């Protein structure tokens, strides 16, 4: 195995080696004793990191084996174990674990490794404390990333957990299920050093995975560090940031990563976290921060399905409206959004939040007092966005923005119950988003952009974007008439002939659609089939 450092192939052997050390009892222990001695000698090899790991692993196991005292009495702990293990840590035994874990016969590997990971907690705690204390003292109040990372062995361990456990909830549950891991978590919660603290937050996020695990993580902070302390930290940072006008980004990014993970996988609890991080998160968003996008993503997670959207909409409108001066024209409104949502992350976050809020509802006469009211200006903003999208950098990025946009557009189409008409209403008809949505769609890069999604089709994620493109076109055809007659007159800039020539004339889209009926995804095929009917 030594005669491999990078070679991924090493992973194949880890199951055998992890389990082998696990079953040291089998060996004799004349043999085990000999290996132990040989390994201490073997500290000569820094170049082979993976030797260093495996040996360190053996030690983690050996300690347990020495439990039958014939062996243990014989040995002196400081010489026999701690000195060597410490040497291994120094020689990057944790780092390579992290690598094994990060770069994840799965059953054998997962089982054997999780046994490894756990052995380290229970048997090793002396080492953890030794390292933690070592780290706290070492740095002194221009540190380079390399200097920060040198001593970081404890944090690396936390990451080891994060990578290994992630997904896998199964494994993750072990932490939460009984109240030593649970001790481990409590212990980790205690480590105050900003870097340890941030990795602790990240590790827990990984642990939060199941709907079930997420629930425990909720309780962990709430009941037996509290959520309140967390928001407090965010609040404090906010003040420091603004009063002032990397370390913080690490901490904050972690704070958000964690809140996001749980809020997403939760239920009625969501409201509780919502009311509490909502107010604080809103305040943080006002500050520039690199981060803006991230809080928007978290905010979105908080947004509830029901009526009690209102606090969120106000925050958003207020948070676009506040600085901007709006003339009585449209452009000034666009400017408000453009000024605030300066960078790419800001926009993507914004889109996710908006997608969520627009899902099914918002307040009447929104923006009243400050500006011409209503939802319409937000859709105009998308002109800035998906108009632009075509000229992304970075396909992955373009797709990232395009998708939220399609989902929003589709939602707005569903947003009005067309059926009531075919088989203060006026005001309601004015307020719904379906109106501005149709207006923009008719604006022929708008139609084109939607159309190109169809022309160029097929990772799986991209496939979804395609389905949405079709579904939207179908929806438009079905109710194109409704908009022109009923909706447009009420609420009575301009009209239709443009999309048709382009869809109908322009042929490639028609042919592409034809090809789609066959290709399995029923959503794409069934919809493609419907469209041609609508076009005809």
């Amino acid at each position: 195995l030594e005669r491999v450092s990078l070679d991924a192939v090493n992973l194949a052997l880890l199951m055998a080696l992890l389990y082998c050390f696990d079953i040291s009892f089998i060996e004799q222990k004349q043999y085990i004793a000999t290996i132990h001695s040989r390994l201490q000698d073997s500290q000569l090899w820094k170049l082979p990191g993976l030797q260093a790991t495996v040996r360190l692993a053996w030690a983690l196991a050996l300690r347990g084996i020495s439990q039958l005292p014939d062996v243990t009495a014989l040995a002196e702990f400081t010489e026999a174990d701690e000195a060597m293990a410490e040497l291994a840590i120094a020689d990057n035994v944790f780092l390579f674990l992290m690598e094994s874990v990060v770069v994840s016969q799965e059953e054998f590997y997962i089982r054997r490794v999780h046994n490894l990971i756990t052995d380290f907690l229970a048997l090793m705690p002396m080492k953890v404390k030794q390292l933690r204390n070592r780290a706290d003292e070492d740095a002194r109040m221009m540190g380079n990333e390399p200097p920060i990372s040198l001593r970081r062995d404890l944090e690396h361990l936390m990451l080891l957990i994060g990578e290994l456990y992630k997904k896998n909830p199964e494994l993750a549950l072990e932490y939460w299920c009984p109240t030593v891991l649970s001790k481990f978590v409590r212990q980790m919660g205690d480590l105050l050093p900003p870097t340890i603290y941030i990795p602790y937050l990240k590790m827990l996020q990984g642990l939060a995975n199941g709907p079930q695990c997420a629930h425990y993580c909720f309780s962990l902070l709430k009941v037996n560090v509290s959520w309140e302390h967390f928001f407090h930290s965010l609040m404090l940072y906010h003040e420091h940031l603004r009063k002032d006008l990397q370390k913080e980004q690490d901490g904050l990014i972690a704070f958000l990563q964690l809140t996001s993970t749980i809020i997403t996988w939760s239920e009625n609890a969501r409201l509780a976290l919502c009311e509490t991080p909502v107010v604080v998160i809103l305040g943080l968003l006002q500050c520039s921060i690199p981060l803006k996008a991230e809080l928007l993503k978290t905010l979105a997670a908080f947004g509830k399905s029901p009526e009690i959207a209102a606090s969120l909409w106000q925050s958003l409108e207020y948070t676009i409206l506040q600085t901007v001066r709006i003339p009585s024209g449209i452009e000034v409104e666009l400017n408000e959004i453009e000024s605030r949502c300066e960078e790419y992350p800001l926009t993507r976050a914004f889109c996710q939040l908006i997608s969520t809020l627009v899902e099914s509802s918002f307040p009447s006469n929104l923006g009243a007092g400050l500006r011409p009211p209503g939802f319409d200006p937000y859709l105009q903003f998308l002109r800035d966005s998906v108009f632009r999208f075509r000229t992304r950098a970075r396909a992955a990025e373009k797709w990232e923005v395009a998708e939220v946009v399609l989902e929003v557009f589709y939602k707005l189409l569903r947003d009005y119950e067309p059926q009531l008409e075919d088989f203060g209403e006026e005001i309601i008809a004015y307020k719904p988003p379906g109106f501005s949505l149709m207006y923009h769609l008719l604006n022929e890069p708008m139609l084109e952009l939607a159309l190109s999604l169809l022309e160029e089709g097929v990772k799986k994620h991209l496939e979804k974007a395609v389905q949405h493109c079709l579904a939207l076109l179908n929806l438009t055809l079905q109710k194109e008439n409704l908009f022109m007659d009923l909706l447009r007159e009420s609420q009575l800039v301009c009209p239709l002939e443009q999309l048709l020539q382009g869809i109908n004339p322009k042929a490639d889209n028609v042919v592409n659609i034809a090809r789609y009926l066959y290709h399995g995804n029923p959503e794409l095929a069934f919809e493609s089939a419907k469209i041609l009917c609508c076009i005809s």
């Binding site: 709006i326 009585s328 319409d376 447009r488 009575l492 800039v493």
Partner: protein, 231 residues
């Protein structure tokens, strides 16, 4: 490039003239501190110098705004923050009887600055600004079209105003009774102005998503025509 330098010069010089003119009107000033005028007439000045030294201390928000236009300073927060001050200052002087009087003065102040900036979207976010203005004026007597008319006068086109406004309409989850009314006034204002749009399907229209234009667009096409501007 000579032209480049010349035009920038003309712009900056103009600003000083404006600042200079205001200094006369301002009553916060002392005649003996003539030195400022001497400085103004004397030479072109650094933009930051003009901004920091003059605009902020003499609270000439309009000037500050125009200056940042030339600079082309995009930062929306700062731009918006400046706008907030201008609006707030306006409130101070007002007394109420002059709801109409202030109405005019307010429109007057906005239109002037608006004409200079309106070409660029950063200082004049039409989208952001319109509501802001409505909200401000809201604590005043109202006639529909008062807000939008200023933007039209500002130099904003009917077509530009329409799309953004419509977006504001549909975009907002809410009541926006105000927006509906104003847009109603806008459409009425627009149709009469060009002969192109003119006639009957309209009178019925009392702003809703019963967009007369929207219906028109569906059938014929989106192609309104060239931009229409107020004469």
């Amino acid at each position: 490039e000579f032209l480049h330098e010349l035009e920038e010069k003309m712009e900056v010089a103009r600003i000083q003239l404006q600042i200079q003119e205001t200094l006369q009107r301002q009553y916060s000033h002392h005649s003996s501190v003539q030195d400022a005028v001497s400085q103004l007439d004397s030479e072109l000045m650094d933009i930051t110098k003009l901004y920091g030294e003059f605009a902020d201390p003499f609270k000439l928000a309009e000037c500050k705004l125009a200056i940042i236009h030339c600079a082309g300073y995009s930062d929306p927060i700062l731009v918006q923050t400046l706008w907030q001050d201008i609006i707030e200052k306006e409130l101070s002087d007002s007394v109420t009887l002059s709801s109409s009087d202030r109405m005019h003065a307010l429109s007057l102040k906005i239109v002037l600055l608006g004409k200079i900036y309106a070409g660029t979207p950063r200082f004049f976010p039409l989208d952001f600004i319109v509501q802001f203005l409505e909200q401000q004026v809201c604590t005043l007597n109202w006639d529909v079209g008062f807000v939008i008319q200023t933007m039209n006068e500002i130099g904003v086109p009917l077509p530009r105003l329409l799309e953004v406004y419509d977006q504001l309409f549909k975009s907002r989850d809410p009541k926006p009774l105000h927006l509906l009314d104003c847009i109603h006034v806008l459409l009425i204002r627009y149709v009469e102005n060009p002969s192109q749009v003119l006639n009957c399907e309209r009178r019925r229209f009392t702003n809703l998503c019963l967009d007369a234009v929207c219906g028109y667009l569906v059938e014929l096409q989106s192609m309104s025509s060239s931009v229409a501007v107020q004469a």
